[PDB]
Amino acid sequence: PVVVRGWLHKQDSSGMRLWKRRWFVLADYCLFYYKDSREEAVLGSIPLPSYVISPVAPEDRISRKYSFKAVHTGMRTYYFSADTQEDMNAWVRAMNQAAQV
């Protein structure tokens, strides 16, 4: 059921350049996020169908290392950052596989 789980920083949706560390789970074609890795009470969800996920580009003007974005096909863009390059790459690949269902 779960494809991948782990910590990501997520940028706030109001453009204040604030990053919050949440625990993410990809399951059922969606991202679910939680306060921590206990996976107790889901805080929110981003269903992935039709999103395109990629490492950030220069024009995104994101400074945080290992950052990537999910763009809704802009209807809405989410920015995430992982703690390692390997984990970034694994999330981009998993999220695109789900989004391309």
Cα–Cα distance, 86 to 48 (Å, whole number)? 21
Domain total of the chain: 1
Q: What is the resolution of this structure in A?
A: 1.5
Q: Measured between alpha carbons, how far is 49 from 47 in angstroms, rounded to an integer?
A: 6
98: left (phi over 0), alpha (psi -120 to 50) or beta: alpha
CA 75 to chain CA mean position, Å: 16
Distance (Å, whole) CA 56 – CA 72: 14
What is the domain range of residue 71?
Answer: 1-101
In whole angstroms, give the CA distance from residue 6 to residue 86.
12
By what technique were these coordinates determined? X-ray
What does the alpha-carbon distance between residue 54 and residue 17 come to, in Å, rounded to a whole number?
19
